[PDB]
Paper text:
In Mycobacterium tuberculosis the multifunctional heme enzyme KatG is indispensable for activation of isoniazid (INH), a first-line pro-drug for treatment of tuberculosis. The homodimeric structure is predominantly α-helical with each protomer (∼80 kDa) composed of two domains. The N-terminal domain contains a heme b and substrate binding site, which are essential for enzymatic function. A covalently linked “MYW catalytic triad” is formed by the conserved residues, Met255, Tyr229, and Trp107, which is essential for catalase activity (Jakopitsch et al., 2003, 2004; Santoni et al., 2004).
For the W107R variant, the best class produced a cryo-EM map to 3.3 Å resolution. This model surprisingly displays only one heme bound per homodimer of protein. The heme is absent from protomer A and displays significant structural disorder in the vicinity of the heme binding site. Several areas surrounding the heme pocket were difficult to model in protomer A, either displaying minimal or fragmented density (inset). In contrast, the C-terminal domain of both protomers remains similar to the WT KatG. The resolution of the map is sufficient to enable an Arg residue to be modeled in place of Trp107 in protomer B, resulting in disruption of the covalently linked catalytic triad. The remaining residues within the heme site are superposable with the WT protein. The W107R variant is predicted to disrupt the MYW catalytic triad in the distal heme site. The titration reveals a stoichiometry of 1:1 (W107R:H2O2) with no further spectral changes, implying that the W107R variant retains peroxidase activity but not catalase activity. For the W107R variant, the as-purified cryo-EM structure also revealed heme absence and disorder in regions associated with heme binding.
Residue numbers in the entry:
A (entry chain A): 39 to 128, 138 to 193, 240 to 270, 325 to 346, 376 to 739
B (entry chain B): 39 to 196, 230 to 276, 282 to 356, 362 to 368, 373 to 739
Write the structure that this text describes.
């Protein structure tokens, strides 16, 4: 029970339990919402008072604000999950505000999900208390399954765990007071008699007065409330929109044109895109250039594995692998063959852009994935079967100033199972971290198994370790990993030099393979051996290739939201 | 469960964790394998001895027979879950019991066969076929076999060998054996046949390792790795008994009987464990006095088993027949109607426990003549409530974990079904049946050609016509799909005993709640919706439709949140989420809540199952979909789809 590797965490939100069907997109519907008519309904609900729960001060504004803040106050950067865009099992007194909004959800039904309705109720409450917010973006599909200086540091830490700076933390604290700039929160907390303490009576937020950096931050706002009104606008925006993905995922006509630093923005498509006859002119140009299949697949997977299917940030778009925060990570081994791949895939970019049919310019963030797909095509063609990996271009390269080291320092994988990376600070073993990594990328069990089996053989291993590889000749996409694992002629033992690896004796005289910990799980766990026995049969060689191509393509197209 | 209804049971084994894909039907694959090639592969795998698990007598056959038994010996009738066709004797919850010890090394011996076919031979099928072919290879003309037990890639959530926990008394063990074989619907003669002819093949076998559930990963999913001796073979420890029954453990003959009836069987103690019976003879060693267990020796003292066994001592052909029939019943117990047995080995003769529905003997009606039957049904005075209740009662006695029951056969008129409590036999069922029979007679006497309708079709046809009429009265001009091809089976083709288990002790779709149920009504409704293979939205829409239609037990008001009955509308959903009413447990406290409509009026009335949808946090998210202002057509379409899912659920011919 406790130590059982549960595969149920992969199909956590299936399509069988969705009451909407397969053919149902949340992007063609909320764009048709007339927010000018929805705000009237929200105003009516805010003004009225229902008898089953009386209206505090005859107004539901503050309740909606607290519901919105509490719904988007459970975000955590280390894992990404939580936030507002999720299901989060939609306290007690804050589970009735979800049922005080039914008169609005009833008029729309499917064109306005709860995850949008609650947060929009909060934002409209802010706009009704006399505040000019920054904007709003719909499109949060909801899952269908579940003393001062002693607390001052705690406040600075709790917000620091929610990707919140110091000035923005102060803005969020002061804004909640609710935000109407009439109660004069900071206007009295700084000009009041100090004999009135715990020992009118103030609250326990006296940290804002006594903490040095907090007091310095609030000194500006004491005499310049306009900067407070502007800083709370960005703080609220960040609070309710941290969970959602790139800027291209924002819907509705209320979204503001001004792009921010924390969205991880990328430049728009300032040119034409590469056609179909031209990508075949690049694939044959990607090879015959020096790069083998190992380097190309490692580079391509190293830029699209940073995705996080919880807050939908990271991914292959933008092409930040060439930039600073990721070309320095240990898993993307910088002193190895990464500074050479990056330089090689820029001469091709320069050469192609020089001699191009007009203005058909391709970006580096596109060339990296194109090189990966060309490498897989070559590897497959070297193993009998031939296949063309499908491709959806349109990525753009982001400059150094668009990204941010501090925000990207959390995306560093503490352990990457598909590449046998295992650093330090690993409480869980290497199997559960593989499961979590596959859950973040929105991978299903067959997809996870086929991806591991393909990546081991292809060459994507940390520092090209001989671990995992169960093939007599690499640089060829075969199912030889599954066949040699399900094979029962070998005998597995813990390694003599005990460091977490294993050793597969061939039974008779010698040692053939050298396994690992995130590898023998597939050969041991029955629920995964059931899939290994499917991909490692006699006839199912083409099935493995087709499934690997499909899973690879879906992983690469994970973060493609504009198309 | 203590609390927190687990709606993850309604979608277990989904189409996501399924490597084969979506467009893959097993019945179109296994019907093409050369079964002779499969036999020549299995009969060769059970001969070459692997070095990591040496074969006793150089013949794995008995191990395969034991594996086949233990794979289908977990089938329990009282719910139908578990057994052969499931395939869960391979996943974690079942490969860790001490009973199924050394039954994983057995399941890995068949890999050199499964790999040769890959996807045209399921594991849950290959295990049982390997058992049957091992039985065949030792000189035993078995009854038959039928492929088509699809594997499932996710574990679902569903006897001592010495006596009642340390009491080697055949008097004590005999009753336990009889009960644990009643639990699988076995008779007494069939139980004796299984115990005798299953232990004629093979032999039995502290300081062992952990189960594969918690074994080290270098074991490769195995377990129970013993350190005594070489560990595997000639010292193998799997049940710690070390008994050899038959004179030749690799050949079929009645040598069990003369041994168990030509000795006196003193009591001894095994090296590992204890409590085995020994005579006060010589059996060839795999690589010894005649010994017997306590359960096996129970067949010599129990008077009920005494007559059967001592008669089998004189005429062995009776044993040769009864064991074959019992084995056939065992491995095919939970695979379903005879229409699912595909493969060139299926027998032609039918059996009573198969619940046989006779084959059609007339031209089936078309989708051009049913426009007259639907008119006649709706023009016969029968209300929508009666037709819907009859149709649901016909198609609610189905078990998706056992594939038995269902609408086909037309049992709703025969004895075991018409007399149950949930589908009242007082004026409700006994009146609809007469009118339906009259209508079928009128149609058949005036048929165009040889086209003839069967009564088993008319119950579903009347249900469909009633639903169409209700939807037309609500304001939608839809038509409900219907596929004919059902037949009516006579009374002597229905085992009255075998349907007593099918009686629904609690049916959440009709507010029926009897006695003896452990869990409350909500969990019973969840289990019912799991048996019919219904997802959460399908269950919600079915409940919401059946409440308003009027298919309650005794047509009680407990759940009809509508003042306009006989009208298929979502009024059960919009009025449930009406937060302007306040609920209150009734002073009678009979489990029937009631909603005081604002001031003092007790307008509605509910039940513990009709209020879960408005209380459970994750199950209200579905009610809030169909309860919107515009999702009336969506609700109607989803209800029709779920109704077709329930009606055409046992149809395997189509
Ligand atoms: C309550 C009923 C039964 C009990 C308690 C029982 C008990 C046992 C035990 C303790 C073993 C020793 C396992 C080992 O050492 O590997 C065994 C083996 C065996 N059983 Fe049963 N048994 C029962 C019914 C059956 C049935 C119905 C069959 C039908 C085929 C069967 C077939 C076998 C065979 C073939 C073996 C030989 C296994 C081998 O050679 O490794 N038994 N049984």
């Amino acid at each position: 029970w406790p130590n059982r590797l549960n595969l149920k965490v992969l199909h956590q939100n299936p399509a069988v339990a969705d009451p909407m069907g397969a053919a149902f997109d949340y992007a063609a519907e909320v764009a048709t919402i007339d927010v000018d008519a929805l705000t009237r309904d929200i105003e009516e609900v805010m003004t009225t008072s229902q008898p089953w729960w009386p209206a505090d001060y005859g107004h539901y504004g503050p309740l909606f604000i607290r519901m919105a803040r509490h719904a988007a106050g459970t975000y955590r950067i280390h894992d990404g999950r939580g936030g507002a865009g999720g299901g989060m099992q939609r306290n007690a007194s804050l589970d009735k505000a979800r049922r005080l909004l039914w008169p609005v959800k009833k008029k729309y039904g499917k064109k306005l999900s709860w995850a949008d309705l609650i947060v929009f109720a909060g934002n409209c409450a802010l706009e009704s208390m006399g505040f000019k917010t920054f904007g709003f973006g719909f499109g949060r599909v909801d899952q269908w399954e579940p003393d001062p200086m002693a607390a001052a540091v705690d406040i600075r830490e709790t917000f620091r765990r929610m990707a919140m700076n110091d000035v923005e933390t102060a803005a969020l604290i002061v804004g909640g007071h609710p935000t109407k700039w009439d109660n004069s929160f900071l206007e009295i907390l700084y000009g009041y008699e100090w004999e009135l303490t715990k020992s009118t009576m103030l609250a326990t937020d006296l940290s804002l007065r006594v903490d040095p950096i907090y007091e310095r931050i609030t000194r500006r706002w004491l005499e310049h409330p306009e900067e407070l009104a502007d800083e709370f606008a960005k703080a609220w925006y960040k609070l309710i929109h941290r969970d959602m993905g790139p800027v291209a995922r924002y819907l509705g006509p209320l979204v503001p044109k001004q792009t921010l630093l924390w969205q991880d923005p990328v430049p728009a498509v300032s040119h034409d895109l590469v056609g179909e006859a031209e990508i075949a002119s690049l694939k044959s140009q990607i090879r015959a250039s020096g790069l083998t299949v190992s380097q190309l697949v490692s580079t391509a997977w190293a830029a699209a594995s940073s995705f996080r299917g919880s807050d939908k940030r990271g991914g292959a778009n933008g092409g930040r692998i060439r930039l600073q925060p990721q070309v320095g990570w240990e898993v993307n081994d910088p002193d190895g063959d990464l500074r050479k791949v990056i330089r090689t895939l820029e001469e091709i970019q320069e050469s192609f852009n020089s001699a191009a049919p007009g203005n058909i310019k391709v970006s580096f963030a596109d060339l990296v994935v194109l090189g990966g797909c060309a490498a897989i095509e070559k590897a497959a063609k070297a193993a009998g079967h031939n296949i063309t990996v499908p491709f959806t271009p349109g990525r753009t390269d982001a400059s150094q100033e668009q990204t941010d080291v501090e925000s990207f320092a959390v995306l560093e994988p503490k352990a990457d199972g598909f590449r046998n990376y295992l650093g330090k600070g690993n409480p869980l073993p290497a199997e559960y971290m593989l499961l979590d990594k596959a859950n973040l990328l929105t991978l299903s069990a067959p997809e996870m198994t086929v991806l591991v089996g393909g990546l081991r053989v292809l060459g994507a291993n940390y520092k090209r370790l001989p671990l995992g590889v169960f093939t007599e000749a690499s640089e060829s996409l075969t199912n030889d990993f599954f066949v040699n694992l399900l094979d029962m002629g070998i005998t597995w033992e813990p390694s003599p030099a005990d460091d977490g690896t294993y050793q597969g004796k061939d039974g008779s005289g010698k040692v053939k393979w050298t396994g690992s910990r995130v590898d023998l799980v597939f050969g041991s766990n029955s629920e995964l051996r059931a899939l290994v026995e499917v991909y490692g049969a006699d006839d199912a060689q083409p099935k493995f290739v087709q499934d690997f191509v499909a899973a690879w393509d879906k992983v690469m197209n994970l973060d493609r939201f504009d198309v």
